[PDB]
Amino acid sequence: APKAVLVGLPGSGKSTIGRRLAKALGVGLLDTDVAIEQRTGRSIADIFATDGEQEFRRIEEDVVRAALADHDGVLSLGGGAVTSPGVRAALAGHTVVYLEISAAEGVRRTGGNTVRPLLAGPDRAEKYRALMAKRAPLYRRVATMRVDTNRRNPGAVVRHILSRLQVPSPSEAATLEH
Ligand SMILES: Nc1ncnc2c1ncn2[C@@H]1O[C@H](COP(=O)(O)OP(=O)(O)OP(=O)(O)O)[C@@H](O)[C@H]1O
Ligand SMILES: [Mg+2]
């Protein structure tokens, strides 16, 4: 089972923390969005446009379940996987690290806000606020560790996680005797 499954909004650090944590632990890194593309030979966008969100979620759930079973390293989940009840079921029992971020920081860390075409319509910051409102409660539900990334740089985030993922060595005593 993965050492850690990372979940969070866009810009929360799934890629950055994924790499740095996997480096610190000396383990493999798998991202479920990349894994879907690798297993199908189709872009995420194409699967959505062509098959619809529900079939994307189906493919996604199979990939997530396989990775939870087979991957021993760090796993990062695509943002919407937790919307599938079967994915929430599959995660139960795993180490699930929720990288927390505010709307303002999430927008900044994903390229900033956009020009607003119509005063009466929404801008990028407002769309992000909507995604947060819907996703954040689900990340909270599935989490076993919550880490605020708003005021910690990536090195600090990784050190915080490592301090809470420790594994005692069962052969520790004997090692000192040989
Ligand atoms: N703890 C942090 N403090 C400050 N900046 C950060 C932190 N974590 C990540 N960043 C920066 O925020 C940006 C987005 O990070 P990253 O791509 O890792 O997020 P992500 O969760 O993978 O996003 P996406 O869901 O779009 O794949 C990058 O420029 C990265 O350097
Ligand atoms: Mg990423």
Swiss-Prot record:
Catalyzes the specific phosphorylation of the 3-hydroxyl group of shikimic acid using ATP as a cosubstrate. This is Shikimate kinase. Keywords: Amino-acid biosynthesis, Aromatic amino acid biosynthesis, ATP-binding, Cytoplasm, Kinase, Magnesium, Metal-binding, Nucleotide-binding, Transferase. It is an enzyme of class 2 (transferase). InterPro entries: P-loop_NTPase, Shikimate/glucono_kinase, Shikimate_kinase/TSH1, Shikimate_kinase_CS. ATP binds at residues 11-16, 116, 152. Residues 111-123 are annotated as: LID domain. Monomer. Binds 1 Mg(2+) ion per subunit. Its cofactor is Mg(2+). It comes from Mycobacterium tuberculosis (strain ATCC 25618 / H37Rv). It catalyses: shikimate + ATP = 3-phosphoshikimate + ADP + H(+). HAMAP family: Shikimate_kinase.
